[PDB]
Amino acid sequence: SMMELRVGNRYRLGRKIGSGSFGDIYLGTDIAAGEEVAIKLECVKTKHPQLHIESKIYKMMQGGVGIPTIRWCGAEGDYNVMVMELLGPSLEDLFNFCSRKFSLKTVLLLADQMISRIEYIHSKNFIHRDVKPDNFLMGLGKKGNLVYIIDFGLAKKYRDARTHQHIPYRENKNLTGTARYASINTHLGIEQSRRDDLESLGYVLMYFNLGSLPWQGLKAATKRQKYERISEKKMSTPIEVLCKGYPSEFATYLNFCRSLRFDDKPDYSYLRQLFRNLFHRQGFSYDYVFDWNML
Amino acid sequence: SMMELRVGNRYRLGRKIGSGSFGDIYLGTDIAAGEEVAIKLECVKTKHPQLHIESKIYKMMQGGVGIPTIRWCGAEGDYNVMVMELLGPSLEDLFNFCSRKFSLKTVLLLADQMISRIEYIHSKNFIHRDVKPDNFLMGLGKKGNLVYIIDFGLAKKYRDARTHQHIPYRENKNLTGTARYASINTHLGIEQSRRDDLESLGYVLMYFNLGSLPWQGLKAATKRQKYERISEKKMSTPIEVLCKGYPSEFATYLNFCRSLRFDDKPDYSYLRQLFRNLFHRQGFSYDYVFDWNML
Numbered sequence: 001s002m003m004e005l006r007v008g009n010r011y012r013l014g015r016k017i018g019s020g021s022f023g024d025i026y027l028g029t030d031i032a033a034g035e036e037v038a039i040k041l042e043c044v045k046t047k048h049p050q051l052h053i054e055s056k057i058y059k060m061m062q063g064g065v066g067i068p069t070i071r072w073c074g075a076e077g078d079y080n081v082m083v084m085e086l087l088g089p090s091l092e093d094l095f096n097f098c099s100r101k102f103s104l105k106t107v108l109l110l111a112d113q114m115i116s117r118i119e120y121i122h123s124k125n126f127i128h129r130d131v132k133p134d135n136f137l138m139g140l141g142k143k144g145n146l147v148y149i150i151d152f153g154l155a156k157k158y159r160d161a162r163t164h165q166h167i168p169y170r171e172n173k174n175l176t177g178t179a180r181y182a183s184i185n186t187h188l189g190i191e192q193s194r195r196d197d198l199e200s201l202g203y204v205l206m207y208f209n210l211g212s213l214p215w216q217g218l219k220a221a222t223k224r225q226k227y228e229r230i231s232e233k234k235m236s237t238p239i240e241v242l243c244k245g246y247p248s249e250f251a252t253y254l255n256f257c258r259s260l261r262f263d264d265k266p267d268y269s270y271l272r273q274l275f276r277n278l279f280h281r282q283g284f285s286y287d288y289v290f291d292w293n294m295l
Numbered sequence: 296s297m298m299e300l301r302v303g304n305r306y307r308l309g310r311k312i313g314s315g316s317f318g319d320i321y322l323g324t325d326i327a328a329g330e331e332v333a334i335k336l337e338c339v340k341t342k343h344p345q346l347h348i349e350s351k352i353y354k355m356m357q358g359g360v361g362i363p364t365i366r367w368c369g370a371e372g373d374y375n376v377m378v379m380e381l382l383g384p385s386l387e388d389l390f391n392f393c394s395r396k397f398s399l400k401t402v403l404l405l406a407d408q409m410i411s412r413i414e415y416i417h418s419k420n421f422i423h424r425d426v427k428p429d430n431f432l433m434g435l436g437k438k439g440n441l442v443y444i445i446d447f448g449l450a451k452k453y454r455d456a457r458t459h460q461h462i463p464y465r466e467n468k469n470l471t472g473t474a475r476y477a478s479i480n481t482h483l484g485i486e487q488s489r490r491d492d493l494e495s496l497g498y499v500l501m502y503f504n505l506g507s508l509p510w511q512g513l514k515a516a517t518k519r520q521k522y523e524r525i526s527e528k529k530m531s532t533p534i535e536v537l538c539k540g541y542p543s544e545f546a547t548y549l550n551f552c553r554s555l556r557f558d559d560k561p562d563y564s565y566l567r568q569l570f571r572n573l574f575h576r577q578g579f580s581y582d583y584v585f586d587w588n589m590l
């Protein structure tokens with residue numbers, strides 16, 4: 001298998017830059033438009049094609065702050081193809097660039113936007129279900145200060161689009177995302193709701209604070225092995241132990257998310273305010289100057 | 296593009312586990328033998344096929360301590376196929392597992408074997424040219440204490456197999472490996488020799504000591520951009536600055552490697568002895584107990 005220079009007649013395919021849920025991601029060019037893009041590919045022979053479903057979720061999400069624009073989705077030869085707005089580096093990339101050390105200021109600035117992105121998704125009737133640093137990207141140019149959220153391949157509806165009736169409490173039957181950032185309820189095999197995305201973001205923030213999480217594991221392990229080893233450790237590590245030595249707001253955040261009822265509407269503004277209050281007591285300036293901008 | 300359950304009739308193909316030079320790596324089964332293996336695949340439509348060349352280098356290297364066994368190489372359909380002995384996790388995987396903290400004891404134990412692996416390659420007339428944590432794997436079972444070296448896709452001959460006449464001093468024309476661990480001479484566009492592999496190992500050891508290197512960069516960059524940004528930083532960072540706060544042996548090692556002549560035979564035993572002397576002054580026990588064994 002070699003990639004041609006083009007995907008059909010309209011798209012130049014450049015280098016593979018990483019992976020997403022159920023597909024590989026490439027740089028490319030929309031040749032007719034004269035615009036650089038990102039392209040996600042799914043092999044049509046896959047047992048359960050989903051790219052088309054994912055693309056419809058992107059289309060529904062359009063217009064939200066920090067949601068990439070979808071240009072096209074369809075088939076070309078051996079692939080389904082989804083063409084997206086090109087963005088800046090992922091937060092995992094930028095964390096590495098900063099030697100896996102983010103300042104408290106940068107953590108807080110990121111937290112504010114990340115909570116807002118998640119809230120937006122929830123406003124459109126979906127749970128993201130794979131909250132992780134790789135799925136948040138900075139923008140380009142004048143939007144270099146804006147955090148975007150990506151990847152709707154594991155996203156699932158939590159309320160009816162018309163009635164806003166919440167899904168029933170139930171066991172999970174959906175494919176799941178990273179064990180590392182999964183909520184405790186996810187490890188227990190329970191359906192995710194709004195609280196679970198926010199709990200997972202809490203683990204992401206602690207990862208940025210610490211550089212690692214205490215349940216880090218080995219890639220040379222099956223998903224089954226990872227869930228089991230991480231479940232056991234995450235379940236035996238209190239929030240107060242995880243968050244020791246950091247501002248109390250991180251533990252207050254995590255405990256709030258874990259104490260939500262399955263169908264509660266989270267108080268997003270209260271969660272933002274935790275961090276914004278801390279930001280101002282610290283004497284920080286809300287100036288869009290992240291750690292990597294000083295590199 | 297989907298992988299069938301088998302690569303031809305003899306090999307079960309399991310999950311993709313990572314990448315190597317010019318190809319992807321999969322778990323698999325040699326069905327006739329009833330043995331688990333690792334499989335490297337190269338698409339036959341690639342501009343410059345090299346897997347067959349790489350396989351011949353493996354065959355030449357056979358019998359060395361910490362060299363994986365090669366089972367077969369050949370064509371199957373749209374792929375060239377190279378079937379290898381299955382090993383344990385990479386040193387990068389294990390570093391992550393240990394939260395990017397290795398004890399001085401583990402660093403020293405690894406250094407001793409890594410210098411020996413490199414020496415072995417040199418004894419067989421090749422420079423490895425991509426010394427990095429991902430290319431060292433632990434063994435399995437009773438060989439769980441043994442470090443293996445892998446990937447000969449960038450390896451190049453530095454002396455004639457019959458005469459042992461060293462190649463002439465010259466500019467490089469070969470594809471190169473990771474900018475991160477490259478020798479300074481590699482950044483200058485000069486042909487690599489025995490000293491360069493050892494210099495690169497020095498950077499690897501410092502990476503294990505520090506958790507990062509001070510020229511760490513952003514994945515969202517072209518190879519050209521990475522070479523240029525890393526060259527400039529690596530070139531303006533003295534060894535004594537890189538190695539500050541660590542045992543002097545790390546700086547003594549790096550300065551020794553940088554002071555070798557292009558055609559010098561390195562004093563491998565002197566380099567090993569640096570670290571072994573330190574090990575004993577520290578009071579450490581040579582007991583094969585690495586950090587990850589305490590996890």
Ligand SMILES: Fc1cccc(-n2cnc3c(NCc4nc5ccc(F)c(F)c5[nH]4)nc(N4CCOCC4)nc32)c1
Nearest residue numbers: 017018019025038040084085086087088089150514515
């Ligand atoms: F499929 C989608 C859906 C929505 C948006 C995007 N999308 C829109 N812009 C991007 C984007 N741009 C930043 C980037 N440029 C790079 C070049 C080389 C390199 F090595 C990298 F690491 C790179 N990272 N990066 C990614 N990826 C990061 C890598 O892992 C897969 C995701 N997805 C994108 C892709």
Ligand SMILES: Fc1cccc(-n2cnc3c(NCc4nc5ccc(F)c(F)c5[nH]4)nc(N4CCOCC4)nc32)c1
Nearest residue numbers: 219220312313314320333335379380381382383384445
């Ligand atoms: F192509 C060759 C040539 C010579 C030896 C090998 N070779 C022989 N045993 C292996 C091997 N075994 C350890 C392993 N098992 C894993 C399962 C899932 C997972 F996610 C991993 F990370 C895994 N790591 N790992 C690798 N790789 C590590 C990943 O990056 C590509 C290299 N190459 C191997 C492969």
